Design an enzyme around this catalytic site. Structure first.
Site, PDB file in Angstrom:
ATOM      1  CG  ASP A   1     -35.894   3.370  40.884  1.00  0.00           C
ATOM      2  OD1 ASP A   1     -35.157   4.338  41.171  1.00  0.00           O
ATOM      3  OD2 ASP A   1     -35.497   2.390  40.220  1.00  0.00           O
TER       4      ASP A   1
HETATM    5  C1  LIG Z   1     -38.505   4.603  20.559  1.00  0.00           C
HETATM    6  C2  LIG Z   1     -37.118   5.048  21.032  1.00  0.00           C
HETATM    7  C3  LIG Z   1     -36.010   3.980  20.903  1.00  0.00           C
HETATM    8  C4  LIG Z   1     -35.541   3.340  22.242  1.00  0.00           C
HETATM    9  C5  LIG Z   1     -33.996   3.199  22.421  1.00  0.00           C
HETATM   10  C6  LIG Z   1     -33.413   3.667  23.791  1.00  0.00           C
HETATM   11  C7  LIG Z   1     -32.372   2.703  24.457  1.00  0.00           C
HETATM   12  C8  LIG Z   1     -32.287   2.732  26.019  1.00  0.00           C
HETATM   13  C9  LIG Z   1     -31.681   1.471  26.721  1.00  0.00           C
HETATM   14  C10 LIG Z   1     -30.491   1.762  27.688  1.00  0.00           C
HETATM   15  C11 LIG Z   1     -30.609   1.185  29.126  1.00  0.00           C
HETATM   16  C12 LIG Z   1     -29.866   1.977  30.215  1.00  0.00           C
HETATM   17  O1  LIG Z   1     -30.438   2.407  31.185  1.00  0.00           O
HETATM   18  S1  LIG Z   1     -28.047   2.267  30.021  1.00  0.00           S
HETATM   19  C13 LIG Z   1     -27.080   1.891  31.592  1.00  0.00           C
HETATM   20  C14 LIG Z   1     -26.232   3.090  32.091  1.00  0.00           C
HETATM   21  N1  LIG Z   1     -25.715   2.976  33.470  1.00  0.00           N
HETATM   22  C15 LIG Z   1     -26.496   2.907  34.633  1.00  0.00           C
HETATM   23  O2  LIG Z   1     -27.723   2.942  34.528  1.00  0.00           O
HETATM   24  C16 LIG Z   1     -25.808   2.791  35.994  1.00  0.00           C
HETATM   25  C17 LIG Z   1     -26.629   3.281  37.217  1.00  0.00           C
HETATM   26  N2  LIG Z   1     -28.012   3.634  36.863  1.00  0.00           N
HETATM   27  C18 LIG Z   1     -28.653   4.792  37.350  1.00  0.00           C
HETATM   28  O3  LIG Z   1     -27.991   5.504  38.098  1.00  0.00           O
HETATM   29  C19 LIG Z   1     -30.121   5.136  36.949  1.00  0.00           C
HETATM   30  O4  LIG Z   1     -30.220   6.489  37.243  1.00  0.00           O
HETATM   31  C20 LIG Z   1     -31.217   4.370  37.758  1.00  0.00           C
HETATM   32  C21 LIG Z   1     -30.599   3.586  38.911  1.00  0.00           C
HETATM   33  C22 LIG Z   1     -31.908   3.430  36.786  1.00  0.00           C
HETATM   34  C23 LIG Z   1     -32.314   5.376  38.386  1.00  0.00           C
HETATM   35  O5  LIG Z   1     -31.855   5.912  39.511  1.00  0.00           O
HETATM   36  P1  LIG Z   1     -32.922   6.912  40.643  1.00  0.00           P
HETATM   37  O6  LIG Z   1     -32.915   6.014  41.853  1.00  0.00           O
HETATM   38  O7  LIG Z   1     -32.125   8.192  40.743  1.00  0.00           O
HETATM   39  O8  LIG Z   1     -34.221   6.998  39.871  1.00  0.00           O
END
Ligand SMILES: CCCCCCCCCCCC(=O)SCCNC(=O)CCNC(=O)[C@H](O)C(C)(C)COP(=O)(O)O
Ligand SMILES: CCCCCCCCCCCCCCCCCC(=O)OC[C@H](COP(=O)([O-])OCC(O)COP(=O)([O-])OC[C@@H](COC(=O)CCCCCCCCCCCCCCCCC)OC(=O)CCCCCCCCCCCCCCCCC)OC(=O)CCCCCCCCCCCCCCCCC
Ligand SMILES: CCCCCCCCCCCCCCCCCC(=O)OC[C@H](COP(=O)([O-])OCC(O)COP(=O)([O-])OC[C@@H](COC(=O)CCCCCCCCCCCCCCCCC)OC(=O)CCCCCCCCCCCCCCCCC)OC(=O)CCCCCCCCCCCCCCCCC
Ligand SMILES: CCCCCCCCCCCCCCCCCC(=O)OC[C@H](COP(=O)([O-])OCC(O)COP(=O)([O-])OC[C@@H](COC(=O)CCCCCCCCCCCCCCCCC)OC(=O)CCCCCCCCCCCCCCCCC)OC(=O)CCCCCCCCCCCCCCCCC
Ligand SMILES: CCCCCCCCCCCCCCCCC[C@@H](O)O[C@H](CO[C@H](O)CCCCCCCCCCCCCCC)COP(=O)(O)OCC[N+](C)(C)C
Ligand SMILES: CCCCCCCC/C=C\CCCCCCCC(=O)OC[C@H](COP(=O)(O)OCCN)OC(=O)CCCCCCC/C=C\CCCCCCCC
Ligand SMILES: CCCCCCCC/C=C\CCCCCCCC(=O)O[C@H](COC(=O)CCCCCCC/C=C/CCCCCCCC)COP(=O)(O)OCCN
Lengths: 603, 459, 178, 128, 103, 88
Positions: free
Chosen positions: F43
């Site tokens: 990934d």
């Molecule tokens: C210590 C600090 C504090 C912590 C707080 C931080 C909070 C973070 C939590 C939020 C979770 C989320 O991801 S928020 C959700 C937002 N929406 C999406 O993720 C839709 C599609 N996802 C993608 O496209 C990504 O890139 C992916 C497929 C994963 C990679 O793709 P690759 O195939 O290109 O690697």
């Protein structure tokens, strides 16, 4: 005849020969650092003799050899005061400088300008010796500014780094804020006592008023980095580790406390200035320990330790114990210089990595630094029969049995506890856990220069307290009888600090994580003082300097008042006068009008 | 006094009869020799003066100024040798003639037993400087700068002539000795108030006093290097010397008359020091620093105490030397970059280390680092002002802190950081420039060994 | 640093950037390695739950409360590598970087030392002198009309050609010249 | 939910907390594209004039010239006397002078009164 | 994601040129051509030219020039305890009042 | 300093070592030129963790814009060598 004066002047004179040879051939070779280190060691072993003579007898001398100028009834001459303070501080400073220079021969080996670096260290040492032995206010001001300029030059050693230049300018700014009070004190003493000489000032000031002592206190707070003017000292860590070990740890930063010590006969006759000194010292030591408790950079932690120790020194000054403050200066020199040496060795061994989150198990991987740092930490916390004992224990005892503030005493006790606490933090996060540095291990201590330089200050931090305490004559009334719980209070609070810090640090292993509280955020950002007081005042002065002083007044209104108004009026009058169509009709009509007026208005 | 004046006059035929390629060498050698002759004048007495004749005298207030004036000409020639390379021989000779005439006028001005002669020469200095500024100037604002410089001075100094002729008609003499010995108090009257103003404003406008300092940045920025050197070093001190000479007849009127000017100078040093913090031009920054220093000198002269006078003399000499060195350094940078902007050429310490050392020493001397004579004058004036009133210490300390701030700002902006990438025409510093800086800086550190030579008649 | 920037950041790049920042700050909070591994795996598990979400609106609503949560608990003193823009040695060696054209002003007595180096330098100068004249025309013919749309440069396409605007990228002083 | 961050003049809003970046429209994308287009044109011009082996001088920057000219020489011709400018100029140029005059005059009157009354104790005050 | 083919090729050519330049930055065994032309033992000479000579000048300067003027060198008076005797006078300070000694 | 002058071979060996310590990717399958998304089925999050592991291994940190287009071990080694100015 009386070799005391000859030897004391000879040490300071021979400290300057490499500066004269800096234009010779040796400066262009790689033997210059060894030359300067040998000169410093010879100066130390030479200056050891007048201290021995004073220890035997108590010799006190004033040397006014060269008369610079005389303004009317005021005579200014190059005068050296060679009292207890000078003949005791010079050997300690020379010993520390010799050790630090031998350390720098190893630490700064790959730096292209090492001869220059060594030359700068020598220049700083010369200026500090000028400051310490000065007998009048003008010479001590000369040293006061010389050490500041050397600090500015050595902090911004890597002049390609913006933060180093910013830190150097910050140090200059705070030191000038102190210089304001220094100049106020000089002006007051010259106006009223008619002298800058110390003897005349001591004679003519039986009840010293508030103004000169307040100026002296402001200068001391500026140069010793008290709570009002503290932030420059932690920012001064941008320079090389030997610079932070020599100047901003044990020699330069005690200059304000030394200035207050030098003027102690006038300090004891004033009670309000003593109160202000006590309160300033207490708030400084508490705030700096509270800042230190939660830092991750090791150099920042040790710098805040130095600031807290200076606060304790000024507390001792505030309780009218100057000789005890001098003894604490001498002890802190040894153990804080060795602590910076250990920190610099750790930093170099880990590829210039300073954060403690990326250093793990070094107790076995590099044991000489470990044992030296452990001994220094024990000395710092006033462990019994250790260099720090003979000063810090007496400080606590004297504060506990004096008619002083309850708040200041409480702050001092909390500061001692926090001192034990961040010493525990340093040891725990630097030596005990599992390794956290990058896999390519380059750890190495097997260098004779580093080992010898560290071990000399190790022997010092073990035995110098006993030797000096047993060799100097008494200078204050002792605290012979004390309540048992009041006698153990320093040890009790220190052991409480160890236990609480260790218990709270052991919980970092637990598999739980929670966001920080408000108190942690306050302590980590140093009480938000740097942010607010470096963004609001600077912006407000610069914006005014551009908008009002530069544009609004100078480029607009001052230009409008005289020159533009004059030009406009003259041009309008020229247009009115010269706009004539050339018709003799109007001209002779005006002549007729004019002729009539002359006949009827002038007779 | 003629043993100095006659060789300076003979400098002109020597220059005009020189070979086309030997004007600079001969002028420099003979100017240096003239300077050596001037050194004899420094020996001074604690008694009245060195009264050579009815026309000229020397004093320990005039002697350091004369020595500095004679010493400045070789440095100005050295600085001007560079940018006048592509100039015809006649015009170079005319430039040297202007410099020699300015030196002669200054030399005769500083001795000047009689006040109308002082006024005549004090105004005669105005013409060569104007020609230098408006003829050999690079920008198009040199004409406006020269107009400002001429008209400010003339508007200030025209009432002084009327005041002087009135004073001679009433008293009967304008010889300084008779004026000093036959001095009489001034009654608090409107006519006396206006006479005081007419006597004071001419020297105030050339200091420059804050609010009347507008001409100075224009004239200094638009002048060639030699003109900037002379304006910053000697021409500013004419007002201070005149005030020191003329405040003998203004008593006891000066005690309350001085307040408007004291307030203006005390606030204007802060104002100009703060202006120096936000400046994009080296020359403008140096000019405003000069304004601050001269405002503090104005405060010293207005306080009118022995320590004030000694500090004012020392500060005048030290400021002249320091400002000349700073202008020379700025010109060395400009002749390489052709921009005159602080932020363009950066990190020059990496490319020019010795010139960076010169920059550091000049900034430290401007910062008034002890035991330089700059701090000697600064501290004497500060102590005198504190005796005048204990509240002045706040303004003096603020000025000191801001002064250190902008001095180190100017040093750091140009010498430290990263070099500008696209600038590749920064050649190694020539021996001429290094010798110029050395001859600027060494006299300061030699004079700090004998401060009594520059402390004036009240030492 | 080396790569030319784009006109904007897509959602996927922003999500990756938040993931990296959160992992770095969690490592800063969790000093010990085993604790960091545990909490980083838990962070990855919490992070990839919404991997398969499809619509744009809810995806944009997410990552936003995530950024706010990150800012609330961002460890105001994170770990920084020494050479990073915030590290303790970010620009330590920038005062030792001297340009290459400074060698053109060396005295002949100085250039007498190191003769082979200066011969090689002259060869490099000749190569640059020819390559620049080729590169000007190559870039003129390759650039789209109306000016470039991005600050990305094309490679060399002929045999003897060199990449356009190569002299000041190849001749960097060094990372640590002294 | 977590406590909100409130920006100020000297502590600006973080880029990742801007609601503007989340409101994406084709006009916004076109604006960003043309911004990077003009930036790339400027960078191309600078690098073309920078890598030229023939150039042996300073690359003149019109932006820097405009900045210095606007800061120094363009002020007065654009100045217009307004109530704001008049009031600010009067305050910032007159108020400090009269304030300091009052302070120093009061201090010196007090000192002179004490000297005339003789109760100041100026012993050892020799140099002034 | 990843490099475009043009980016790949440009990076490859640039890195080859950079490696060539860096290799050219090395020195040959004869490269530093130095032109020669002229016109306890270490501690012993050091202890003479850096300690003995300065202390000779200072002692001569103090003993014969500085002390030639009055009050130039002022020394703290030596402490006098009961029971001591003076070289100059020879008199003996009388003892104290025989305090009652116990513990 | 006393830092040995690391070479291209050392950089490649260290990169392959850290990659073989990554349990998600089989040791036998990976090759210097083995791609990340297609040849090994990883990934993008796996790619960013690989970049972070490289960062922790070599003690310096790669900007995100450069890291997001580092897709093979060979070009990772090339990037590191270009950054640290490695001769051979
Ligand atoms: C210590 C600090 C504090 C912590 C707080 C931080 C909070 C973070 C939590 C939020 C979770 C989320 O991801 S928020 C959700 C937002 N929406 C999406 O993720 C839709 C599609 N996802 C993608 O496209 C990504 O890139 C992916 C497929 C994963 C990679 O793709 P690759 O195939 O290109 O690697
Ligand atoms: C008279 C009887 C004598 C006996 C007395 C009793 C004996 C002892 C009793 C024990 C009492 C407390 C001791 C424990 C200390 C607290 C430790 C703790 O829990 O910290 C974790 C906890 C939160 O940690 P976290 O957020 O999870 O951090 C994440 C990780 O832990 C991050 O961790 P990390 O790895 O990054 O770093 C770890 C670090 C990080 O931890 C911290 O964040 C430090 C913050 C807490 C320590 C500060 C305590 C010092 C108190 C001085 C305050 C003076 C007044 C200031 C006034 C402020 C005004 C606003 O912690 C430490 O290193 C150790 C901390 C200190 C413990 C060792 C020394 C303690 C002994 C000395 C104290 C008292 C004894 C005096 C001895 C003399 C005898 C009288 O901190 C707190 O919650 C603070 C607790 C107390 C704070 C009180 C102040 C609150 C003020 C709010 C406003 C009130 C109204 C004001 C109105 C004003 C109007 C004008
Ligand atoms: C402290 C006593 C010293 C005794 C030794 C005698 C030294 C003779 C110096 C004569 C005056 C210096 C001339 C200025 C231009 C320098 C020429 C040059 O380019 O050097 C190239 C030469 C060859 O190096 P390079 O590798 O070819 O050039 C590469 C770059 O240039 C890179 O070069 P760099 O990185 O090495 O930097 C150049 C260096 C040199 O540039 C400078 O900045 C030196 C000038 C500093 C003064 C700044 C003005 C402040 C007011 C001071 C006025 C007092 C003067 C006293 C009478 C002087 C007689 C002429 O700058 C510094 O090192 C930093 C200076 C900051 C020192 C702050 C302390 C000043 C106040 C101390 C109190 C002084 C009186 C003590 C009274 C109480 C005790 C009795 O290097 C040197 O020889 C350095 C000069 C020696 C350092 C002087 C530091 C203190 C001496 C001040 C005057 C003498 C005091 C008399 C008391 C004696 C007891
Ligand atoms: C030397 C060392 C340092 C020195 C620092 C240098 C500082 C010296 C310079 C100071 C300059 C400040 C005064 C400038 C003159 C003001 C008038 C002006 O400039 O004409 C342009 C301008 C004339 O243009 P306009 O076409 O008639 O109307 C344009 C306005 O936008 C239309 O405005 P509007 O129609 O809305 O006006 C209505 C109202 C303005 O209503 C207000 O809100 C302001 C009333 C308060 O005006 C009044 O009621 C007058 C009261 O006058 C104004 O617009 C504003 C006039 C009101 C300003 C009040 C003056 C400030 C007070 C300063 C006096 C303190 C000392 C005076 C010494 C006098 C005895 C020796
Ligand atoms: C613009 C940038 C700066 C330029 C330089 C500015 C410096 C010039 C300022 C002149 C200094 C003050 C002038 C006169 C001072 C005398 C004191 C007097 O003014 O105060 C009161 C005087 O009262 C009133 O002020 C009367 C005068 C009122 C008319 C004057 C105009 C006020 C503002 C004008 C300022 C314009 C300056 C710029 C001109 C272009 C005292 O009351 P009184 O006891 O009765 O008079 C004592 C004098 N006696 C004994 C001779 C009789
Ligand atoms: C060196 C090698 C040569 C060795 C042979 C010489 C041996 C010593 C013999 C020297 C002769 C004695 C001598 O020097 O004469 C005194 C003479 C002073 O002159 P006087 O007129 O007597 O009084 C001063 C006011 N007029 O002393 C000297 O000059 C020599 C030593 C001077 C002191 C050292 C000065 C160093 C600092 C320089 C000044 C720094 C700035 C001023 C600081 C102000 C501080 C308040
Ligand atoms: C940078 C520009 C500054 C320009 C100068 C500003 C101040 C000018 C000084 C005032 C001008 C007149 C000077 C007076 C000449 C001296 C003669 C004298 O003092 O005698 C007085 C003469 O006094 C006067 O006549 C003064 C009249 C003033 C008329 C000219 C006004 C010019 C402007 C005045 C206001 C501005 C002054 C300060 C300006 C501040 C700076 C801009 C007494 O005359 P008698 O009648 O013989 O004796 C009286 C007993 N029977």
């Amino acid at each position: 005849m009386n070799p005391f004066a000859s030897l004391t002047l000879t040490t300071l004179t021979i400290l300057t020969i490499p500066i004269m040879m800096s234009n010779s051939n040796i400066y262009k070779t790689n033997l210059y650092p060894n030359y300067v280190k040998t000169t410093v060691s010879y100066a130390f072993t030479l200056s050891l003799v007048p201290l021995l003579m004073f220890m035997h007898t108590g010799q006190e001398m004033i040397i006014s050899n060269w008369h610079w100028m005389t303004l009317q009834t005021v005579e200014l001459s190059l005068s050296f005061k060679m009292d207890y303070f000078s003949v005791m501080f010079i050997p300690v400073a020379l010993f520390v400088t010799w050790s630090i220079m031998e350390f720098s021969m190893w630490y700064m080996h790959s730096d292209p300008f090492i001869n220059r670096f060594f030359k700068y260290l020598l220049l700083f040492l010369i200026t500090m010796m000028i400051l310490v032995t000065a007998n009048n206010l003008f010479q001590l001001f000369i040293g006061w500014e010389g050490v500041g300029i050397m600090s500015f030059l050595l902090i911004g050693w890597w002049h390609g780094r913006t933060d180093a230049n910013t830190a150097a300018l910050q140090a200059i700014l705070y030191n000038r804020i102190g210089d304001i009070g220094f100049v106020l004190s000089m002006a007051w003493f010259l106006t009223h006592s008619n002298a800058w000489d110390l003897q005349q000032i001591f004679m003519l000031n039986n009840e010293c008023p508030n103004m000169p002592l307040i100026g002296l206190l402001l200068a001391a707070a500026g140069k010793s980095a008290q709570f009002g003017l503290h932030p420059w000292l932690p920012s001064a860590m941008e320079g090389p580790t030997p610079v932070s070990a020599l100047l901003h740890s044990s020699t330069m930063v005690v200059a304000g406390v030394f200035l207050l010590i030098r003027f102690y006969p006038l300090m004891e006759t004033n009670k309000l200035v003593q109160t202000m000194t006590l309160c300033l010292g207490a708030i400084t030591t508490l705030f700096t320990a509270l800042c230190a408790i939660t830092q991750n950079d090791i150099k920042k932690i040790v710098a805040f330790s130095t600031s807290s120790q200076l606060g304790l020194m000024m507390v001792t000054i505030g309780i009218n114990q100057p000789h005890l403050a001098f003894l604490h200066i001498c002890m802190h020199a040894f153990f804080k210089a060795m602590l910076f040496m250990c920190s610099g060795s750790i930093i170099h061994s880990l590829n210039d990595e300073q954060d403690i989150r990326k250093m793990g198990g070094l107790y076995k991987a590099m044991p000489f630094t470990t044992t030296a740092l452990i001994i220094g930490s024990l000395a710092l916390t006033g462990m019994p029969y250790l260099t720090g004992f003979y000063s810090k224990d007496l400080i606590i005892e004297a504060v506990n049995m004096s008619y002083t503030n309850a708040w200041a005493l409480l702050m001092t006790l909390i500061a001692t506890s926090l001192t034990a606490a961040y010493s525990t933090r340093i040891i725990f996060f630097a030596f005990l856990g599992k390794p956290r540095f990058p896999p390519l291990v380059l750890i190495n201590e097997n260098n004779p220069l580093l080992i010898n330089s560290i071990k000399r200050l190790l022997i010092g931090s073990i035995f110098a307290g006993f030797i000096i305490s047993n060799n100097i004559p008494p200078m204050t009334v002792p605290n012979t009888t004390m309540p048992l719980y009041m006698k153990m209070t320093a040890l009790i609070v220190t052991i409480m600090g160890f236990m609480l810090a260790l218990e709270l640090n052991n919980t970092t292993y637990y598999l739980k994580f929670k966001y920080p509280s408000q108190t942690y955020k306050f302590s980590n950002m140093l009480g938000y003082y740097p942010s607010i007081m470096h963004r609001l005042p600077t912006y407000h002065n610069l914006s005014m300097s551009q908008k009002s002083a530069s544009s609004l007044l100078d480029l607009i209104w001052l230009e409008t008042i005289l020159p533009k108004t004059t030009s406009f009026i003259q041009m309008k009058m020229s247009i009115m006068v010269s706009n004539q169509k050339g018709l003799i009709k109007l001209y002779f009509l005006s002549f007729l009008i004019t002729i009539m007026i002359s006949m009827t208005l002038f007779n | 006094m003629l043993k100095i004046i006659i060789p300076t006059t003979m400098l002109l035929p020597m220059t005009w009869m020189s070979k086309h390629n030997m004007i600079w060498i001969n002028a420099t050698v003979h100017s240096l020799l003239i300077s050596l002759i001037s050194l004899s004048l420094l020996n001074q007495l604690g008694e009245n003066s060195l009264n050579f004749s009815l026309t000229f005298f020397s004093d320990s207030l005039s002697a350091p100024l004369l020595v500095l004036t004679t010493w400045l000409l070789p440095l100005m020639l050295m600085a001007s040798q560079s940018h006048l390379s592509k100039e015809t021989t006649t015009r170079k000779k005319l430039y040297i003639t202007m410099l020699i005439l300015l030196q002669l006028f200054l030399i005769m001005t500083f001795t000047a037993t009689e006040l109308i002669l002082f006024y005549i020469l004090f105004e005669a200095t105005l013409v060569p400087t104007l020609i230098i500024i408006t003829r050999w100037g690079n920008q198009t604002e040199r004409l406006n700068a020269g107009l400002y410089f001429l008209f400010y001075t003339l508007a200030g100094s025209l009432p002084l002539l009327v005041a002087l002729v009135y004073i001679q008609n009433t008293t009967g003499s304008l010889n300084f000795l008779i004026i000093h010995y036959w001095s009489h108090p001034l009654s608090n009257s409107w006519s006396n108030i206006f006479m005081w103003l007419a006597c004071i404003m001419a020297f105030m406008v050339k200091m420059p006093l804050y609010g009347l300092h507008l001409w100075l940045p224009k004239a200094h920025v638009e002048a060639p290097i030699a003109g900037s050197m002379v304006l910053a070093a000697v021409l500013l001190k004419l007002g201070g010397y005149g005030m020191m000479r003329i405040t003998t007849i203004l008593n006891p009127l000066t005690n309350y008359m001085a307040y408007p000017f004291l307030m203006l100078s005390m606030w204007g040093m802060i104002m100009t020091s703060s202006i120096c913090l936000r400046q994009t031009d080296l020359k403008s920054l140096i000019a405003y620093s000069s304004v601050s220093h001269m405002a503090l000198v104005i405060v010293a002269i207005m306080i009118q105490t022995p320590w004030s006078f000694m500090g004012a003399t020392a500060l005048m000499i030290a400021h002249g030397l320091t400002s000349s060195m700073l202008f020379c350094l700025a010109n060395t940078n400009y002749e390489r970059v052709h921009s005159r902007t602080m932020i363009l050429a950066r990190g020059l310490q990496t490319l020019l280390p010795l010139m960076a050392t010169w920059w550091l020493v000049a900034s430290l001397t401007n910062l008034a680092l002890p035991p330089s004579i700059n701090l000697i004058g600064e501290l004497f004036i500060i102590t005198a002002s504190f005796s005048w009133s204990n509240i002045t210490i706040i303004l003096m300390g603020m000025n000191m802190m801001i002064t250190a701030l902008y001095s180190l700002y100017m040093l750091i902006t140009t010498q430290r950081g990263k070099y500008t990438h696209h600038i590749n025409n920064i050649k190694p510093s020539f021996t001429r420039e290094n010798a110029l800086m050395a001859l600027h800086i060494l006299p300061l550190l030699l004079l700090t060994l004998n401060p009594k030579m520059i402390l004036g008649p009240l030492y | 640093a080396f790569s030319a920037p784009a006109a904007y950041l897509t959602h996927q790049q922003k999500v990756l950037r938040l993931y990296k920042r959160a992992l770095r700050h969690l490592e800063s909070w969790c000093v010990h390695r085993d604790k960091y591994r545990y909490f980083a795996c838990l962070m990855r598990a919490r992070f990839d739950e919404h991997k398969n979400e499809k619509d744009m609106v809810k995806a944009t609503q997410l990552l936003r409360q995530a950024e706010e949560e990150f800012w609330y608990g961002q460890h105001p003193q994170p770990y920084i590598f020494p050479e990073s823009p915030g590290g303790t040695s970010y620009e330590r060696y920038e005062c030792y970087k001297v340009p290459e054209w400074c060698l053109d002003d060396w005295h002949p007595s100085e250039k007498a030392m190191y003769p082979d180096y200066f011969a090689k330098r002259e060869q490099w100068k000749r190569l640059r002198r020819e390559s620049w004249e080729r590169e000007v025309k190559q870039l003129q013919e390759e650039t789209p009309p109306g000016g470039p749309r991005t600050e990305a440069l094309p490679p060399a396409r002929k045999e003897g050609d060199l990449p356009p605007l190569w002299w000041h990228i190849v001749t960097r002083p060094r990372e640590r010249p002294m | 939910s977590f406590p909100k961050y409130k920006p100020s003049r000297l502590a600006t809003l973080p880029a990742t907390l801007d609601p503007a970046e989340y409101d994406i429209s084709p006009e916004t994308r076109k604006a960003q594209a043309e911004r990077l287009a003009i930036r790339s044109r400027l960078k191309r011009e600078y690098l073309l004039q920078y890598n030229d082996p023939n150039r042996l001088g300073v690359i003149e920057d019109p932006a820097l010239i405009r900045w210095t000219y606007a800061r120094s020489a363009n002020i007065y011709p654009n100045f217009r006397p307004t109530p704001k400018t008049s009031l600010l100029g009067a305050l910032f140029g007159i108020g400090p002078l009269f304030f300091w005059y009052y302070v120093f005059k009061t201090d010196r009157d007090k000192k002179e009164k004490l000297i005339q009354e003789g109760k100041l104790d100026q012993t050892f005050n020799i140099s002034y | 994601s990843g490099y475009t083919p043009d980016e790949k090729l440009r990076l490859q050519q640039l890195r080859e040129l950079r490696r060539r330049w860096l290799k050219d930055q090395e020195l040959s065994p004869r490269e530093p051509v130095l032109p020669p032309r002229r016109v306890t033992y270490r501690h012993s000479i050091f202890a003479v030219t850096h300690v003995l000579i300065p202390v000779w000048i200072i002692h001569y300067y103090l003993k014969y020039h500085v002390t030639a003027k009055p009050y130039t060198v002022v020394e703290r008076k030596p402490r006098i305890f009961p029971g001591d005797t003076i070289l100059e006078t020879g008199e003996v300070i009388p003892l104290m009042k025989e305090f009652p000694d116990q513990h | 300093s006393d830092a040995p002058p690391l070479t291209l071979e050392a950089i490649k060996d260290r990169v392959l070592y850290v990659l073989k310590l990554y349990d998600k990717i089989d040791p036998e399958k990976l090759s210097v030129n083995s791609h990340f998304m297609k040849d090994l089925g990883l990934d993008s999050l796996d790619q960013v963790e690989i970049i972070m592991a490289m960062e922790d291994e070599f003690g310096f940190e790669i900007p995100d814009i450069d890291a997001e287009k580092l897709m093979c071990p060979q070009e990772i080694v090339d990037y590191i060598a270009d950054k640290k100015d490695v001769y051979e």
